[PDB]
Amino acid sequence: NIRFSRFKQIWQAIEKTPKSKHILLKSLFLKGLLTHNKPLLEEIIRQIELIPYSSDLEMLGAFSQDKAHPLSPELLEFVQEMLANESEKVLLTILMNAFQSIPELSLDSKTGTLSMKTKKALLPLLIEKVDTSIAKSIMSQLTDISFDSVLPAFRPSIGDPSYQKTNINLNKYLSLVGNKTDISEFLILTIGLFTSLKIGDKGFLQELSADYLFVRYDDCLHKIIEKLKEKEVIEQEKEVQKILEASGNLKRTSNNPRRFFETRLAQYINGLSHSEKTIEIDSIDKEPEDEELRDNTLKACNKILQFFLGDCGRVDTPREMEQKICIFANGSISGHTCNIVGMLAKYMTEYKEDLDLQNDINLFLIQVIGVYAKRGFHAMLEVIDVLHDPYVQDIFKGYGVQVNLYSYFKENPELAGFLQHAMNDATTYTQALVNK
93 lies in the binding site for another protein (CB under 8 A): no
Distance CA 182, CA 258 (A): 11
Q: How far is CA 160 from CA 217, 268, 295, in A?
A: 31, 11, 18
67-86 residues in contact with another protein (CB under 8 A) are none
150 lies in the binding site for another protein (CB under 8 A): yes
> CB-wise, 205 or 293, nearer to another protein?
293
16 lies in the binding site for another protein (CB under 8 A): no
> CB-wise, 78 or 154, nearer to another protein?
154
For residue 109, the minimal CB distance to another protein (Å) is 13
Q: Which helix (H) or strand (E) holds 204?
A: helix 202-213
Q: Which long-range contacts (CB under 8 A, 24 or more apart) does 121-128 make?
A: 122/34, 122/70, 122/71, 123/95, 123/99, 125/71, 125/76, 125/80, 126/71, 126/76, 126/79, 126/80, 126/83, 126/95, 127/80, 127/83, 127/84, 127/91, 127/95, 128/80
252 lies in the binding site for another protein (CB under 8 A): no
What's 288's DSSP letter? P
Beta strands (DSSP E) in 104-205 are none
284 lies in the binding site for another protein (CB under 8 A): no
> CB-wise, 170 or 312, nearer to another protein?
312
137 lies in the binding site for another protein (CB under 8 A): no
* Helix 390-397 vs helix 333-350: crossing angle, to nearest 10: 10
Select the span of 180-188, 315-323, 361-369, 413-421 touching another protein (CB under 8 A). 315-323
> CB-wise, 214 or 307, nearer to another protein?
307
Q: How far is CA 65 from CA 30, 36, 106, 145, 211, in A?
A: 16, 7, 15, 22, 53
Kindly state the number of chain residues that form the binding site for another protein, as judged by CB under 8 A. Answer: 60
> CB-wise, 167 or 349, nearer to another protein?
349
225 lies in the binding site for another protein (CB under 8 A): no
- Residues that bind another protein in the complex, under the rule CB under 8 A: 18-20, 24, 27-28, 31-32, 35, 37, 39-40, 43, 46-47, 49, 97, 100-101, 111-112, 148-153, 270, 277-280, 282, 287, 298-299, 302-303, 306-311, 313-314, 316-320, 322, 346-347, 350-351, 353-356
